[PDB]
Design an enzyme around this catalytic site. Sequence first.
Site, PDB file in Angstrom:
ATOM      1  CB  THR A 174      -1.019  -0.070   1.012  1.00 45.54           C
ATOM      2  OG1 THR A 174      -0.096   0.202   2.436  1.00 45.54           O
ATOM      3  CG2 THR A 174      -1.818  -1.085   1.147  1.00 45.54           C
TER       4      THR A 174
ATOM      5  CG  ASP B 175      -2.259   1.867  -2.129  1.00 47.41           C
ATOM      6  OD1 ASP B 175      -2.043   2.429  -1.295  1.00 47.41           O
ATOM      7  OD2 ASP B 175      -2.364   0.203  -2.416  1.00 47.41           O
TER       8      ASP B 175
ATOM      9  NE  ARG C  95      -3.709  -4.796  -4.996  1.00 42.68           N
ATOM     10  CZ  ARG C  95      -2.799  -5.643  -5.658  1.00 42.68           C
ATOM     11  NH1 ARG C  95      -3.188  -6.155  -6.765  1.00 42.68           N
ATOM     12  NH2 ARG C  95      -1.646  -5.698  -5.281  1.00 42.68           N
TER      13      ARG C  95
ATOM     14  CE  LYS D 159      -5.080   1.511   0.972  1.00 42.57           C
ATOM     15  NZ  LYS D 159      -3.961   0.796   0.137  1.00 42.57           N
TER      16      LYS D 159
ATOM     17  N   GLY E  92       0.152   1.310   8.398  1.00 45.03           N
ATOM     18  CA  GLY E  92       0.156   0.724   9.624  1.00 45.03           C
ATOM     19  C   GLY E  92      -1.149   0.301   9.955  1.00 45.03           C
TER      20      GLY E  92
ATOM     21  CB  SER F 222       4.382  -2.702   1.272  1.00 45.19           C
ATOM     22  OG  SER F 222       3.338  -2.500   0.318  1.00 45.19           O
TER      23      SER F 222
ATOM     24  CG  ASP G 156       5.320  -4.227  -2.998  1.00 45.00           C
ATOM     25  OD1 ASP G 156       6.219  -4.996  -2.562  1.00 45.00           O
ATOM     26  OD2 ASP G 156       4.491  -3.831  -2.454  1.00 45.00           O
TER      27      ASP G 156
ATOM     28  CB  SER H 108       0.660  -0.945  -4.232  1.00 46.22           C
ATOM     29  OG  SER H 108       1.220  -0.433  -3.198  1.00 46.22           O
TER      30      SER H 108
END
Lengths: 210, 223, 254, 245, 234, 142, 249, 218, 241
Positions: free
Chosen positions: H27, H43, H45, H59, H73, H155, H192, H195
């Site tokens: 994320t 992001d 997702r 978010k 977190g 991440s 990654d 995300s």
Amino acid sequence: QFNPYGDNGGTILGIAGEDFAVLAGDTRNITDYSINSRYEPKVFDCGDNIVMSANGFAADGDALVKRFKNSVKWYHFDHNDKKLSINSAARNIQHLLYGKRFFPYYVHTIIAGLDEDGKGAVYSFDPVGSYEREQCRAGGAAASLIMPFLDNQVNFKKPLKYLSVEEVIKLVRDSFTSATERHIQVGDGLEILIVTKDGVRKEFYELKRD
Amino acid sequence: TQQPIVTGTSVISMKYDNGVIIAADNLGSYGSLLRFNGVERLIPVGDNTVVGISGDISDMQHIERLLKDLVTENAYDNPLADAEEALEPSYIFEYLATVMYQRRSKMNPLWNAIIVAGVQSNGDQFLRYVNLLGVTYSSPTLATGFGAHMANPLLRKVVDRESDIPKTTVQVAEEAIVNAMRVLYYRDARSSRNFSLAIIDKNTGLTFKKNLQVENMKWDFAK
Amino acid sequence: MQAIADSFSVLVKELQYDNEQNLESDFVTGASQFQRLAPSLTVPPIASPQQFLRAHTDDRNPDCKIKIAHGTTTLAFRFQGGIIVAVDSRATAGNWVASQTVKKVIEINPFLLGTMAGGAADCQFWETWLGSQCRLHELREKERISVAAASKILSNLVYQYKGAGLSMGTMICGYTRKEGPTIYYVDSDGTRLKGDIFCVGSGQTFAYGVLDSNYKWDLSVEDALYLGKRSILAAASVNLYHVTEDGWIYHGNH
Amino acid sequence: TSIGTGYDLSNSVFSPDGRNFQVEYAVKAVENGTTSIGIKCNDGVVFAVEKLITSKLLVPQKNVKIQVVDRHIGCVYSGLIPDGRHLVNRGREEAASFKKLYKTPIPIPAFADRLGQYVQAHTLYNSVRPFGVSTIFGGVDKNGAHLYMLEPSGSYWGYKGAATGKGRQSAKAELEKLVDHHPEGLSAREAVKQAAKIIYLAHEDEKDFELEISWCSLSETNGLHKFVKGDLLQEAIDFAQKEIN
Amino acid sequence: MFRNNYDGDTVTFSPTGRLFQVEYALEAIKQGSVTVGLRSNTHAVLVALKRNADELSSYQKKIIKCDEHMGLSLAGLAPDARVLSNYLRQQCNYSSLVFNRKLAVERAGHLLCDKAQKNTQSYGGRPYGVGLLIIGYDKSGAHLLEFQPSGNVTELYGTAIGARSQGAKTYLERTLDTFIKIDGNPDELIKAGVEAISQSLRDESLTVDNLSIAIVGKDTPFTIYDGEAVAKYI
Amino acid sequence: MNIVPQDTFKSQVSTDQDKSVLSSAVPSLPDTLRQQEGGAVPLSTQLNDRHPLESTLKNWETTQRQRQMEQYRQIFGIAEPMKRTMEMEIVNRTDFNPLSTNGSIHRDILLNKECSIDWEDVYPGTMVGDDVHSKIEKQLGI
Amino acid sequence: MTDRYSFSLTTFSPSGKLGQIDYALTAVKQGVTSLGIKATNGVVIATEKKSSSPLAMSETLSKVSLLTPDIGAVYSGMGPDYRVLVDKSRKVAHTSYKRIYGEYPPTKLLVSEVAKIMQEATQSGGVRPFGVSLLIAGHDEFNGFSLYQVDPSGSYFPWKATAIGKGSVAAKTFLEKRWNDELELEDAIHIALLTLKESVEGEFNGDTIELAIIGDENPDLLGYTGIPTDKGPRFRKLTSQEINDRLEA
Amino acid sequence: GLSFDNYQRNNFLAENSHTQPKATSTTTIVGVKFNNGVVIAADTRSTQGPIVADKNCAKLHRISPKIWCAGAGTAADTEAVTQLIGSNIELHSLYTSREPRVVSALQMLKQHLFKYQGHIGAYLIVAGVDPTGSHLFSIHAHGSTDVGYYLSLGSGSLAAMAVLESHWKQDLTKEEAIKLASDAIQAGIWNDLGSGSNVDVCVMEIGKDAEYLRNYTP
Amino acid sequence: SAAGYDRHITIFSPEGRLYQVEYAFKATNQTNINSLAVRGKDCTVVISQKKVPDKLLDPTTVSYIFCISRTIGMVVNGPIPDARNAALRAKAEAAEFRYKYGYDMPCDVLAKRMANLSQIYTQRAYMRPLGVILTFVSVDEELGPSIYKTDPAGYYVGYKATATGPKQQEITTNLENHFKKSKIDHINEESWEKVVEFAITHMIDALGTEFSKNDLEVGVATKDKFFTLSAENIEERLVAI
């Protein structure tokens, strides 16, 4: 984790006569395999002809003796300077020891004096407070080298009742000399306090370490 | 605390016929790193008391603050603070021992070893040792750390017992202390070359010597 | 306002003597430490006092170890007109000489008795405290305290400290006019049982079998004393106590 | 009207004219106290106190009217003895705390401000009582010599010369005359002599009295606060007697 | 009449600037009997005239031992005297316990003054109404202090407080240099004190029942003589 | 001058430490019925196995208040902390609302929390007790 | 101890009337006149901005305050009490409702909280009752528009149109004849202006009177765009220029 | 405040037979500062462990109409802390009758996070504009704050930081800043597994209303 | 005069008034000195009258102007003990605001805070109001020069210009006439020295009989710092008309 306890060695011995009491101790303060002091008394005159000695952790013994002396001072203040008996002192020490049940003193305690009738009296206290009256008690890391000597050279059933103060002093000195010969910790001096109706008398002897 | 961070090594003290002599080196080590040079580890309290502290430097400074507060409060409100109403070494040692034992019982001890030296009003020498556990004891010679294992026999060779105290002059005691400090500098990795000395004498008062260096070094026996 | 001003006015903090409890325990302001009906017990100021005590109580001077009452056989039964309490007087070797027999039975009052069967100091201290509480209750109510009340007081007290480290198991035996003869067992885990026959110690199954062989309500004083002595001997110097409405009577071997 | 009925039985109360009568009663209590004066010379301060004679049983060296708060601060007061002792103790505590915290002797203006705040805090609630003392204090710091007077209301001011007590009016008139006669400056010893003269003049009422003087100057006392030795005290007494007659 | 409106408590001033409650507390001292204190360069003594309720009663204890080197005698209320004696005992005990140091007489006087002043400025607590005479021996020598419950302490060679105590004060003033220079002879100082307190008697005679003595010195700890122990001084 | 609270652990324990809730038949023992905690909660269980952050959160504003008072004493003198504490004590003692627990407006003004919200404000949170008379007895000390 | 308590300041009179509450009402009746009018499209709250000194900046002090984006209030009585109560109400609107239910409280519940706070001061041992009267105008989804009046005693009542202050009786008499169920927001504003015109003794312009409205949403006042479901504030304080324009017309 | 009840019960259940249910751990989050404002992107997702839970997650949190933040977190902790600080900021702005400042929100967040000694797992990027200008800060869960021009978190923060280091310069326009933030989020999405999906964007400029864009990529 | 109570505490009279607050208001004029505050283009000037009846008093220690912070200055009308109490509390409040919110305290926020404290004093029965009037002057970074006055009643308000004292009516009327003539809510001068000279002239023509350098006290607040002038600065300003 900080360790609040320790050990300083030392040996003490209390004997009760027919009209006197004797409390002796070796005057050597040692840490692990090192000599802190060659003369550090561990037996004190705690007021009205009562001698007290706590052996083990030195700081705990000093604190307990200090607290007991202050309690005796306030007892004299409260009740017309009344003399404190040996059994009342024993119960006071029991309460002082048990007040730290969950954070105990790391000491073994011996007190000596005269009872109401006038005979010698010796009381022994475990670290948490339990106490009892005994004719003879040895504490420290020499008791197994002192008690058999006394049992061999005297009987508690020569009966102990007929012994004089000089004979008791001689027996204590001989037992402590034997322990000094056999045990590394014991030595460097021996202080003896004798409690009679005339008061408390102090004697000192030099052991085999100078 | 849990462990010292900046630490002092050793303090050595002896009694002679007229007073006491104490000494300690000036160094604060950060682990194996000899970090701070010029740390005074002897605290002169009053005109007749000297306190030597070895161990955590922060706790040593805290104890210095306590001693200064005690000295300031003594004059409140005594107009004879410089007179017979000064602070005896016994008072200071009793206060310090009480503090150390109380903090030990609170599980937050001061990681220090303290030697109090001085001369009483009547002229009796005073020399006592206390540590983080509150264990207190007295002896004609006292030392902390590696001094307790190396300098102590050297000092006891001079003042072996109580009867030898009147036979020891100040020169002999000072020479023995200097030799013991030299031995400590030889055989202690955390030691320092520079040290301070204090002489408390019932006639000449307090003599404080600073910036003393170990001399007469023997290193020629190599090749 | 004066107290507020003094609080913000300037050694005592380091000595921790600004707190009432520290001054009281060190006997600074008076002998008020020895005047508390409910004693105050020191606990380490750490997050884990129980684990600290347990770790430090199993570590090595023989003299500086907490004394534990020996697991000797103890027996108690109520037959018709009293309670027979039987113990074995078999002393243990040590570095001391005893001026009298070991006091394996605590005399709470001229009418109550208790057994140690646990930690010596805990039993002595708390049974002396229970005796003081019973004396105060009798002074207040002008009547002898019931055995059930004393057992319940002791049980509540030992339950308040459950898990702290206390170790004691006692048998409170008493004869009152309203209830008769009653025996309760109080454990350090808060257990409180009422019973007619109690046997404890290292060996008590044999003593219980001997009792069950020859137990009945229609006994006599001499028969009950003989039965208790025989049971103690079979479980193996047999101290006996006979409790009646007038109090307890001690027999060395009779 | 100096007696305000209905608005004078409690501490923190405003009169319809906006006055606090308990503070004025405390000032009246001060006005009946002993006469104490202070003179600010060029590089120091001088404190003078008229001491009433007492029984010979008193130890001469253990009863001094002039109080010393810190080594560079002198202080006298007129009013109630317990209140004066309490204020002197508070001042000593403040000076000690400042010296401990900031490693320098406390400046006189800061000490005066702290003392005035403490005094004024006692006129805010009905459960306390205003201080029945007026305090003349002073000393020497890095900025020079300072002399202040503090009143029961918590109001303090810096003065060239201050006086309080029974004979405050005559002492104030003499101080004004001295200021007029010395527009440029005044020395320490001349200040001591004038303080002795003013103290002797202020006693116009029968009762024998003695005089206490105290110096605090850089040239003489090296910035510390000291009393007066025998020679200077005798000289000042003789000068005052000569001026009287 | 006007005084009646301004004596409610200690937080009220009169229009003329007087604190009447503290004055009443000071006046409460005269209700007690007479005690005398006097010291020399080596010893300090206190003499007390005790009183009983009636023939079948016992006598009041006017001398209290505070420490092995310090004591005091009372004149006035009983509760405040008890409180102040206990406070002084606690202070001496604290000093000895923390520093192994004997509490000074001047320090005890200062502590008493600080404690007593706070009751004369707050609400809810009356001022103390007991005068005290404190004798002691310390590193500065022998000391005698007079404590007045307004919060005042004075250091003097000799004094007397209580009812009809002016005669004793006058006698002590007159025979000052005579009793000052009595060193190493405690009996002479005690006899001088008894003679001084004899001037305050009125239709009464000092007996073994109503006379109490206290003494402290360089090698003499604070000792109290009562009953037959004072029979030699009568 | 503390940022994180210190010395939050008990040093001594007893069976009569809770003076408000004590038995009348045995005054040296607590009254289990009037505690209304569950009936099986010995005091010793409160000395072990506690969340480390519970003590920090429970006494956090008090520590900041004490540090502020110490700073005032160091910089301003005794008078400033004395006056602050006196005002706060007067405000706290005058108020008595047995039917509510929310603090007064003047207390928030003195604490400088007029426009401040924490989780204590959002979350302000029987057979025996919890009535007016118990609170009256607790307040008056009878 | 006598320090553990303080006797109640408000006590019943022999006639059964709490004297302090009545005196607080008397103090309220001596204040400047404020009024509120409820219409089918909004609620108008108006007051007169008194000025002891002509050199004072009138815009620095506002007698109309935003409680929530949909609820506003005006006071008559003592200004400091108004300020303290407004701050407390703003704090309570968030501590009690928005942090719990994720939305602002309705008008009635906020008025009830304010009334409880005001009542708690009439049964205390050291605070006098608040000497103010409150007119609170709000809007909520499930009850439309509402107007409430809160007394110093802590009693609140809903009103179709009301006025408090010195000329409360005359303003009430005028509003009795000028209110109907078909009234509009603009008509309500005009009626409020006419009613205030009869109470101001001095200069009557846009800098001496203050008005605010609870009407439709104002998405231009949100300060951000992009979320269709975020409704704009409905409370709007009319500027002095708008007041002058309405006075001219 | 927050309750500590059933702590011992939960520990016993964990140690004997039960497993405590897990909490959502959120994320990529990015913040880019341009010459006249800031842009904050995230992001959309959200995945519950190895399984995707939603392809459109918001978010971006709002503190003030011109002060926004994005958190990583524990999602519950992030949301609760942001809402509490927003309530405090609104009350402060009402009290002072002034526009709130980014420094005030930063101070409140820092003190609140330091109060709990890191037990609140919220790592925030806070951007905004105020009368003093445009500000962008990063806040750690233990109560430490840092100042920067471009920030990344989550991440996939390393890919986003690489993209930012590639294509960032002092003088940037609104469109260029939005494109750079979108490119960083896209790189975090592609390189990654934490995300995916769309991007939420919030642009705050000086003197203009904040512009919120949902699903900028389509 | 209050009939029963209200002679001690702050509760409502039967007429609905707080007599203690009014008496505290009356207590503010005991000093018999006047103060005047005006706003420049980018500065604020406060001028107060000094009276030293006692020749023994040190003039340098007499002052009623305080520096609350770097930007905010305060002028107090009333007795000096409450003045110093309010000054210390204002300093503490400003520092606490700076610590808690991360930026300097504005003048209006400090005035509102002191007003809330005054409201506490006026409502609590066991607290008394301070008989002083406070005037905070500064140059706010969002509002330019600013003057805000707070009274014992708990009421605060900002002024284009203000004057408080026993003779405040004359100065207020003169300022109002000047503002009506010039049709400006401030002074159109770019230097604070000219504003100081204008304020001195206004005070002279309001009070009358003029005054010297030892009878005045001047404080100037700019956008950077608030400072207080000395005797030489005041005398030099006096020279320039």
